[PDB]
Paper text:
The X-ray crystal structure of the complex between fHbp and the Fab fragment of JAR5 was solved by molecular replacement at 2.98 Å resolution. Continuous electron density allowed modeling of residues 30–255 of fHbp, and residues 1–218 and 1–216 of the heavy and light chains of the Fab JAR5, respectively. The interface between fHbp and JAR5 is formed by 21 fHbp and 30 JAR5 residues, which contribute a total of ~800 (on fHbp) and ~700 (on JAR5) Å2 of surface area to the interaction surface. The epitope of fHbp recognized by JAR5 is composed of two loops comprising residues 84–91 and 115–123, which are localized on the more polar side of the fHbp N-terminal domain. Epitope residues 119–123 are located near the interface between chains H and L and make interactions with both chains, while six residues of fHbp make direct polar interactions only with the heavy chain of JAR5 (JAR5-H). The six fHbp residues directly bonding to JAR5-H (Asp85, Gln87, Gln115, Ser117, Gly121, and Lys122) are asymmetrically distributed between two loops consisting of residues 84–91 and 115–123. In addition, while loop 84–91 is located on the periphery of the epitope-paratope interface, loop 115–123 is more centrally located within the interface, and it reaches into a groove of the Fab JAR5 to become partially sandwiched between heavy and light chains. A model of the ternary complex fHbp:FabJAR5:Fab12C1 was generated by structural superpositions, showing how the physical separation of the JAR5 and 12C1 epitopes allows their simultaneously binding to the same fHbp molecule.
Factor H-binding protein (fHbp) is a surface-exposed meningococcal lipoprotein that binds human complement factor H (fH) and is one of the recombinant protein components of Bexsero® and Trumenba®, two recently licensed vaccines against serogroup B meningococcus. Anti-fHbp antibodies can elicit complement-mediated bactericidal activity and inhibit the binding of fH to the bacterial surface. In the present study, we investigated the structural basis underlying the synergy between JAR5 and 12C1, two murine IgG2b mAbs. Here we report the crystal structure of the complex between the Fab fragment of mAb JAR5 and fHbp variant 1.1 (also referred to as peptide ID 1), and present a model of the ternary complex of fHbp bound to mAbs JAR5 and 12C1.
Author numbering:
A (entry chain A): 30 to 255
B (entry chain L): 1 to 216
The structure:
């Protein structure tokens, strides 16, 4: 599938990201490439992570937990399940604290100017959030109307099974085809979503959603293919 | 607040020996993250406290292998394995689990050296002082063990008892000796109004009082 992924959002300028799985560990820096080629397509791969920096000669761990990678053929995305984090803010201790957030959404972006000029495409894939990679994403794009819409199903948390309301395809800053819209729960707005189109023939979609729940804003990683 | 109880105000130890100083918290200092937020410091007189132990057991950089720390969660112990003269001071335990950060009362580490004799020195008032109007006859009874000593002053033979100050040293960090200074202060004329001045040191090591004098 996608053979490499450049880590950008996932590891900032003066950080090192230590990934470990099945006894092996490798360290990455910003701009470094992740060998997604070795990973299974259409599944979440999990690694132990430690995000680190160096302060006046000593190595400091900022956060640790589980690093997740979802691989498709022309797109892939990463996410972080924090388990422990530095509370540099108040009690300067490493505190047990769980948060889930998307890292990088990468791949071969489809140009807005090189999209199919017509026809209707259906994408099927995964929606994954905190402790739950079992969600199903269904998304439809009408290339004549240049509009897309979809839905998220099969997530354990009921408020995360939402509609991805109809939205226009637009060019982003790099003229990549992107769809940014509203998230609905039982037909009422409860958040926002964004999906990029990937592959030379718009084979795939990948992106994320942010849903407001009674427990706060929750992030959902999204990836589907024709 | 969390209270640090350092029961013993002092703790006797002989050189080459093993010492233990105990601390006690009013709450388990072990965090849910597994780390026990306890410090140990040493403060020598006229100096800032120096760090010895962090995270209850870890030895701060540049601290001799001699030192170590252990603890339960509410009971902590600082341990010096082979006690040197330079360990003499006050040991404070500190918690930094929650605000406010609180310290233990302190535990003075007293060294038990073998009885030593003073080296009494007498000095007449400074040529500089006399022109300023005064006269301070100073006496130094240095490097003696133990602290129990008494000094007398003889002016031409008659006992001098009023206008004399005695300053005592903290146990010496090189030989675990004690020292003190006696200072008989008079006016320019009052001092020149007499000829012989002497120092009478009385210590356990000598039944026969220790004397040091000068004549003009």
């Amino acid at each position: 599938g996608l053979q490499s992924l450049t880590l950008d959002q996932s590891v900032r300028k003066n950080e090192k990201l230590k990934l470990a799985a099945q006894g092996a560990e490798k360290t990455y820096g910003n701009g470094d490439s992740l060998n997604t080629g070795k990973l299974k397509n259409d599944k979440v791969s999990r690694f132990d992570f430690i995000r680190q920096i160096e302060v006046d000669g000593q190595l400091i761990t900022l956060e640790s937990g589980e690093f997740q990678v979802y691989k498709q053929s022309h797109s892939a995305l990463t996410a972080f399940q924090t388990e422990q984090i530095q509370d540099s803010e108040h009690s300067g201790k490493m505190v047990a604290k769980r948060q889930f957030r998307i890292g990088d959404i990468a791949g071969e972006h489809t140009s807005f100017d090189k999209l199919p000029e017509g026809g209707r495409a259906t994408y099927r894939g995964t929606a994954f959030g905190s402790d739950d990679a079992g969600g199903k994403l269904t998304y439809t794009i009408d290339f004549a109307a240049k509009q897309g819409n979809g839905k998220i199903e099969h997530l354990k948390s009921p408020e995360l099974n939402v509609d991805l309301a109809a939205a226009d395809i637009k060019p982003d800053g790099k003229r990549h085809a992107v769809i940014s819209g509203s998230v609905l729960y039982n037909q009422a707005e409860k958040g926002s979503y964004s999906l990029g189109i990937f592959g030379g023939k718009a084979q795939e979609v990948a992106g994320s959603a942010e849903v407001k729940t009674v427990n706060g804003i929750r992030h959902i990683g999204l990836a589907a293919k024709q | 607040d969390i209270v640090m109880t350092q029961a013993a105000p002092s703790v006797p130890v002989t050189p080459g020996e093993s010492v233990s100083i105990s601390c006690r918290s009013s709450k388990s200092l072990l965090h849910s993250n597994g780390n026990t937020y306890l410090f140990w410091f040493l403060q020598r007189p006229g100096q800032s406290p120096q760090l010895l132990i962090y995270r209850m057991s870890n030895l701060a950089s540049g601290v001799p292998d001699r030192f170590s720390g252990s603890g339960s969660g509410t009971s902590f112990t600082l341990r010096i394995s082979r006690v040197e003269a330079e360990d003499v001071g006050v040991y404070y335990c500190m918690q930094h689990l929650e605000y406010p950060y609180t310290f233990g009362g302190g535990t003075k580490l007293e060294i038990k050296r073998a009885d030593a004799a003073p080296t009494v020195s007498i000095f007449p008032p400074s040529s500089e002082q006399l022109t300023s109007g005064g006269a301070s006859v100073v006496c130094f009874l240095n490097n003696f063990y133990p602290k129990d000593i008494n000094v007398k002053w003889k002016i031409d033979g008659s006992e001098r008892q009023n206008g004399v100050l005695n300053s005592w040293t903290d146990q010496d960090s090189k030989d675990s000796t004690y020292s003190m200074s006696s200072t008989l202060t008079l006016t320019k004329d009052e001092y020149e109004r007499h000829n012989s001045y002497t120092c009478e040191a009385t210590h356990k090591t000598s039944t026969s009082p220790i004397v040091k004098s000068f004549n003009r």
